[PDB]
Design a protein around this ligand. Structure first.
Ligand code: YHR
Lengths: 381, 380
């Protein structure tokens, strides 16, 4: 094992989100705005479409085979990135990274849900898994930055590949993905899960918080150059507090959510993220963003740790104990924000403006915040 | 004398707040006295309409009090306040019928309006140094908070130990002491013009919606309390004690601290905390579960009251010509609106749907209105 498959998911999410973030400081320097924006969103769009095809499959194949597929797909994704020097290869490698990320994330979260049956222990495990994901997001970009600065471009991809082989050796050691074991219980269909307001409310809260982070992610530096006229070295330093607060919140609230009540934690988290998004566009220097960005990260960790086990609790309370479809919906809500963010952020900012855009983000978060009371006590079947 | 006028206005404001706070755990207890049976569902709407009468009459009487104060000075209008306060105090003690309580509430409202206007006018006229007026108004307004702290447990502690009429007799006797002291005694931008711009209307709406939580929690919390957890009759006054104590700590601390972090952020946080506290209030299964949500509601209401009053002052000073009671006059419209609309709609809501749905609606209203305080910052 119960605790044995926790490091396999921790390591698997650590490297996958490492490849997601390490690509940032190395790609646009090689090619030298809207043309590169579609490249960053290739992972989100393709992985969004492949998400509905991974959920229903898990009822018969199992979780081990998707995890091994995520390992191998990350292997090709890092090896192609290490050697690619053209857009036509970079887009294909990024799409492979996206599909591998979707496979590995869905399989890992499903395996974590299936391994732990107690509610509090499952919440703690999901908190530590999201902590590993936040740690990977924190360590990705500076790692590639220093590698491309002193050592070279292909070196970080090779190092991530070596770590990937080590992770795959771990998977072969513990999981043993050699046989197809179908789950005895037949999972509920994915379309029927969209007719349950509990799952829709939880997925909407997760998607709205992740959209609130993924909109501020790509368009913040453009506003920084347009208004503050700041040096380039602290562009990642501005978003560093968001990652650090994300890691701290997801590591600390995994035990606190059970005691404080999940619905109250989700409500307070979305209120905090709405207030932080409101307060972000009023800063006039880099020092004013450490507060609101840290609050945004803490609120996102609040919502994630509160509503990741709430999907499993709802599925156990109402439907059968097959966790693939609900967490597939959760991953879709996770990744549609990253699909919407970098492609359309510049267009929306040029159309309406950045402070207005954060106004709608905070307003929608605050207005949908009272809807989290519905999850206080979903009646059983 | 300077001390005499200050003590007169302080005891008058305290008496008004005490009479407001002392009827909360007495009216439902009497109406039950005529656990047990849940027959109060048929009378909840009448209980709310009795509470709304004072606010309705006060809202009707605020525009009128100005001309009489201008024509015939200030001391004569204040004398009517004490006598009507005496009549309301005696009538509340000797009341036995539902009809008489409405008359007592209406007289209490008219006396409160007359006493407030006359006392603040006399305090403004007596002190003319332009600097001690702030301290005098501060102590006069803090008398209301002290009376609010002392009044709520008083009514629910003297009813079951001494008698129903005893707190009303003591309040009337306290009012009578000022009569001997009161016996030995001796312009622009009207309110309807000030409410036109949206910066002041949003402020008044924010204050009214923040106080509407306690306004709706007054008439229906005791009935729900006896219906659902069967506590003895002397916990009802103590249950609202956290709602006052947390209000005092909130108003002091955030009057100290709000200007550093921003007035609009404090208002938004207070509105959100009001919404979450009202949402978490009806989930308690015992009296000990209410010290948390009530304390949070009091703290958030203190946040809103301490943060939005300076915003109203700056807004009224920036564009229009203000007087000493300009912020008081606009603020009094918000509290009167809230107290008039709260219980009357709340009783109908608890009759039509369940009691927790009323708190759900008020919390949702507070949460959706909390974004609208963003407009107040950097006014033109
Ligand atoms: C009845 O007592 C009041 O009516 C006062 C309070 C209203 C409300 C309240 N009622 C309760 C009754 C309870 O019994 C069960 C228990 C708890 C509460 C609470 C807790 C929360 N609480 C807050 C109190 C607010 C007070 O009003 C001001 O503080 C004020 C200050 C000013 O100076 C800045 C003004 O001028 C600008 C001004 O303009 C008119 C008003 C208000 O009137 C004086």
């Amino acid at each position: 094992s119960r605790q044995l498959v926790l490091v396999v998911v921790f390591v698997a999410l650590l490297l996958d989100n490492m490849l997601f973030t390490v690509v940032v400081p190395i790609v646009p320097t090689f090619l030298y705005i809207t043309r590169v924006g579609v490249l960053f969103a290739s992972k989100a769009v393709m992985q969004l479409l492949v998400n509905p095809f991974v959920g229903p499959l898990t009822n018969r194949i199992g979780y081990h085979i998707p995890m091994f597929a995520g390992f191998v797909i990350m292997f090709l994704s890092t090896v192609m990135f290490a050697f690619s020097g053209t857009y036509t290869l970079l887009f294909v490698a990024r799409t492979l990274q996206g599909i591998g990320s979707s496979f590995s994330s869905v399989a890992g979260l499903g395996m974590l849900a299936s391994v732990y049956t107690d509610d509090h222990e499952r919440g703690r495990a999901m908190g530590t898994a999201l902590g590993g994901l936040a740690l990977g997001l924190l360590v990705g970009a500076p790692f590639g930055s220093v590698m491309y600065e002193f050592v070279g471009k292909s070196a970080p991809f090779l190092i991530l590949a070596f770590l990937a082989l080590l992770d795959g050796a771990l998977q072969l050691c513990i999981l043993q993905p050699s046989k197809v074991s179908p789950e005895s219980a037949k999972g509920t269909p994915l379309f029927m899960l969209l007719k349950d307001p509990y799952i829709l409310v939880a997925a909407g809260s997760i998607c709205f918080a992740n959209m609130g982070v993924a909109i501020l992610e790509p368009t913040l530096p453009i506003w920084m150059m347009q208004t503050m006229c700041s040096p380039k070295w602290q562009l990642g330093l501005a978003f560093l507090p968001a990652s650090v607060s994300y890691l701290i919140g997801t590591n600390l609230f995994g035990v606190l959510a059970n005691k404080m009540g999940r619905w109250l934690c989700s409500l307070i988290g979305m209120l905090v993220v709405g207030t932080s998004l409101l307060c972000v566009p009023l800063a006039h220097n880099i020092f004013g963003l450490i507060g609101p960005n840290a609050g945004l990260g803490l609120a996102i960790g609040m919502v994630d740790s509160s509503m990741m086990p709430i999907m499993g609790h709802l599925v156990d309370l109402r439907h059968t104990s097959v966790y693939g479809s609900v967490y597939a919906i959760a991953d879709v809500a996770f990744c549609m924000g990253f699909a919407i963010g970098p492609s359309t952020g510049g267009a929306i900012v040029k159309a309406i403006g950045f402070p207005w855009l954060m106004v709608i983000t905070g307003v929608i978060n605050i207005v949908y915040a009272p809807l989290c009371y519905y999850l206080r006590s979903p009646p059983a079947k």
